[PDB]
Design an enzyme around this catalytic site. Sequence first.
Site, short mmCIF file in Angstrom:
data_model
loop_
_atom_site.label_atom_id
_atom_site.label_comp_id
_atom_site.label_asym_id
_atom_site.label_seq_id
_atom_site.Cartn_x
_atom_site.Cartn_y
_atom_site.Cartn_z
N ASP B 27 0.83 -1.20 0.00
CA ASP B 27 0.00 0.00 0.00
C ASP B 27 0.86 1.25 0.00
OD1 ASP B 27 -2.82 1.01 0.10
OD2 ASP B 27 -2.00 2.09 1.83
N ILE B 28 0.41 2.25 -0.75
CA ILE B 28 1.20 3.47 -0.95
C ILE B 28 1.21 4.36 0.28
CG2 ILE B 28 -0.65 4.85 -1.93
CD1 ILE B 28 1.47 5.87 -3.96
N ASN B 83 -13.01 -2.95 4.00
CA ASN B 83 -13.85 -1.80 4.32
C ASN B 83 -14.99 -1.69 3.31
OD1 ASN B 83 -12.16 -1.03 6.45
ND2 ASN B 83 -10.86 0.20 5.06
N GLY B 89 -15.07 3.28 6.03
CA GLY B 89 -13.88 3.97 5.57
C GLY B 89 -13.31 3.48 4.26
N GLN B 90 -14.14 2.94 3.37
CA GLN B 90 -13.62 2.42 2.10
C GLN B 90 -13.08 3.57 1.26
OE1 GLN B 90 -16.38 0.04 -0.16
NE2 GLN B 90 -14.93 -0.23 -1.86
N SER B 91 -11.82 3.44 0.84
CA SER B 91 -11.10 4.52 0.15
C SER B 91 -11.11 4.40 -1.36
CB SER B 91 -9.65 4.56 0.63
OG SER B 91 -8.99 3.33 0.38
N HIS B 96 -10.96 -4.70 -1.94
CA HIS B 96 -9.57 -5.00 -1.64
C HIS B 96 -9.43 -5.44 -0.20
CE1 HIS B 96 -10.20 -0.67 -1.04
NE2 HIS B 96 -9.21 -0.65 -0.17
N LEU B 97 -8.51 -6.37 0.02
CA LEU B 97 -8.21 -6.87 1.36
C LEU B 97 -6.92 -6.23 1.85
CD1 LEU B 97 -8.71 -8.90 3.67
CD2 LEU B 97 -7.30 -10.51 2.39
N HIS B 98 -6.99 -5.54 2.99
CA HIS B 98 -5.79 -4.99 3.61
C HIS B 98 -5.14 -6.08 4.44
CE1 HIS B 98 -6.54 -0.59 2.99
NE2 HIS B 98 -7.78 -1.03 2.85
CL LIG Z 1 -10.44 0.81 1.98
#
Ligand SMILES: [Cl-]
Lengths: 115, 110
Positions: B27-28, B83, B89-91, B96-98
């Site tokens: 992740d950036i 998320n 808080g989905q960005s 996607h899985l963090h």
């Molecule tokens: Cl997210």
Amino acid sequence: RPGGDTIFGKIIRKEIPAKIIFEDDRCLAFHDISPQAPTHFLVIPKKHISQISVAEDDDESLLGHLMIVGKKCAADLGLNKGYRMVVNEGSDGGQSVYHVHLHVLGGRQMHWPPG
Amino acid sequence: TIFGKIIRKEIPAKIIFEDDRCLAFHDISPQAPTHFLVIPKKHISQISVAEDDDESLLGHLMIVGKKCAADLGLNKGYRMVVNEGSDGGQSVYHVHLHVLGGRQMHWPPG
Ligand SMILES: [Cl-]
Ligand SMILES: Nc1nc(=O)c2ncn([C@@H]3O[C@H](COC(=O)NCCc4c[nH]c5ccccc45)[C@@H](O)[C@H]3O)c2[nH]1
Ligand SMILES: [Cl-]
């Protein structure tokens, strides 16, 4: 005893009570006893897997089923503004019951970072 | 989404693993010493719209995620996060899985 003798295996076998949201042949969704959000429930497999780090390649569909059930229960619970799904692994991840479980939290703004 | 550009290799990302149906990359804006994402190549905008025939694919993200975490040395554990929506808080509206580790993760998880 199918599911093992953790608190989660006992909940699966109805030996310890829980507030059950949804149940099928592969999993169980129930509310968390120590909620961290206005809505906070768990989705667990009925098959005992101690942690995600030992999940097998053939558990792919079962783990995917956990998230689909999680998002269906969230909708049925009216979490229309969103929610957060969390799986913890081991000591750094914060795991305290060694039976695979998905947290689903909602009903408030979740913050970043996720702990 | 920007994740679409990353899958198409149109912008750079520090890729950890790739197969025919998913991509894993750092992740950036990392929130732990190790923080990566596992994303499907299929454009599912958000977990709440995933279909039942996506169960194998979503599970594949988690198995890839736990395999990358092991490969990245996370032997003391890690946290996986998906998320949904504004409260979650989905960005980016590509599911996607963090995966976060390398430090103690705290409770509550946000
Ligand atoms: Cl997210
Ligand atoms: N319904 C229900 N009945 C029970 O008897 C019971 N016993 C435990 N639990 C729930 O399982 C969950 C266990 O899942 C975790 O391991 N999550 C992390 C919590 C945690 C414990 N220790 C940590 C250290 C660092 C970070 C996080 C943690 C908790 O939310 C707990 O309230 C229960 N839920
Ligand atoms: Cl996209």
